[PDB]
Design an enzyme around this catalytic site. Sequence first.
Site, short mmCIF file in Angstrom:
data_model
loop_
_atom_site.label_atom_id
_atom_site.label_comp_id
_atom_site.label_asym_id
_atom_site.label_seq_id
_atom_site.Cartn_x
_atom_site.Cartn_y
_atom_site.Cartn_z
N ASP A 1 -31.35 -94.07 -5.10
CA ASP A 1 -30.24 -93.37 -5.76
C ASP A 1 -30.66 -93.02 -7.19
OD1 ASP A 1 -27.82 -92.31 -5.82
OD2 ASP A 1 -26.77 -94.15 -6.16
N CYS B 1 -25.60 -87.24 0.69
CA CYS B 1 -26.04 -88.47 0.06
C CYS B 1 -24.75 -89.17 -0.33
CB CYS B 1 -26.99 -88.18 -1.11
SG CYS B 1 -26.48 -86.82 -2.23
N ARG C 1 -29.55 -86.07 -4.58
CA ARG C 1 -30.60 -86.07 -3.54
C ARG C 1 -30.34 -84.89 -2.59
NH1 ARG C 1 -30.06 -92.47 -2.44
NH2 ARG C 1 -27.91 -91.98 -2.98
N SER C 2 -29.08 -84.62 -2.25
CA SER C 2 -28.81 -83.48 -1.36
C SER C 2 -29.24 -82.16 -1.99
CB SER C 2 -27.33 -83.42 -0.99
OG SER C 2 -26.99 -84.55 -0.19
N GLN D 1 -29.63 -83.87 -9.90
CA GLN D 1 -28.93 -84.72 -10.88
C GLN D 1 -29.81 -85.15 -12.05
OE1 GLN D 1 -25.92 -85.59 -11.65
NE2 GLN D 1 -26.39 -87.27 -13.02
#
Length: 279
Positions: free
Chosen positions: A182, A216, A222-223, A260
């Site tokens: 994460d 995610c 992550r997506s 992110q």
Amino acid sequence: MPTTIEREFEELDTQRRWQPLYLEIRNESHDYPHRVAKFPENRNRNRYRDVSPYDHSRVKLQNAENDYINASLVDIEEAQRSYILTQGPLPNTCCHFWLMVWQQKTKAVVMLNRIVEKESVKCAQYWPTDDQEMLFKETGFSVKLLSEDVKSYYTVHLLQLENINSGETRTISHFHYTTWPDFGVPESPASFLNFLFKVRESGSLNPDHGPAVIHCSAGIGRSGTFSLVDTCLVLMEKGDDINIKQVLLNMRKYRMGLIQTPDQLRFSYMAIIEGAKCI
Ligand SMILES: CC1(C)C[C@@H](Nc2cccc(-c3sc(C(=O)O)c(OCC(=O)O)c3Cl)c2)CCN1S(=O)(=O)Cc1cccc(NC(=O)CN2CCC(c3ccc4c(c3)oc(=O)n4[C@@H]3CCC(=O)NC3=O)CC2)c1
Ligand code: NA
């Protein structure tokens, strides 16, 4: 001779400008209405108050009194590849998640998170880890684990999705990336690309089946990384010359905040550079 993206990567890595480039993307991103996500009835359908689908791209649950799910249809025309990016379903939205998978004729679900990460629950257990049927009474669907393929850094579950209201059943490929931390990156471009290529090989990113569902926990970090690489490689396979920042900004018109961290952006470039070498 170095490619344009290779030269760009080298200058960003030698001048340590990933962090400024990332903030430029946030600054150049366009905000759109996301008002349905803010209705009082949808408060418990959102995992994160700051991560909402846009009203012009959200996936709508058909024939439902409340059509809302935190999920976005990302449709880059030049790529002729559309995907759905969504959050990790909540206990009360697993039923909506499978309803969407059914209605969208989705063949593959790509799950990039673990259920528990950094001492918190990021996603409900929305599929059977055992041989017991998992029932979603609110929308009329049942899920069964048919088979599993455990690899070194991911697992593929074959899931049987039953629409109890129409009798019909479909086999869903559940691609579970279990080694992507994460707010972090995959272990290597090669292992990421091997996973992406396996998702593609299932034919589940083709225009013949419905859009793949990528998720995610928030459906943006992550997506977004996974989607940017896949979309840029698809555009590069069609021979069109791309600018990664422009592709990411275009994708951000469909769902806010894709990618992110600067490290995730950096990894995107790396995987795209490695993917281009295969092409
Ligand atoms: C979505 C969020 C909120 C998410 C937040 N992260 C986050 C949050 C929560 C959870 C998580 C988790 S928790 C989790 C886990 O696992 O636990 C996760 O997962 C992790 C994993 O997976 O790794 C993740 Cl992830 C992360 C990060 C930030 N974003 S954000 O950046 O996207 C926001 C956003 C959204 C959309 C866009 C913009 N940017 C702009 O709007 C810029 N603007 C553009 C126009 C521009 C202008 C304006 C007027 C102008 C102008 C130009 O020109 C003109 O002319 N004018 C006027 C015109 C009128 C006039 O007359 N004159 C003028 O001058 C100004 C700049 C920003
Ligand atoms: Na590599």
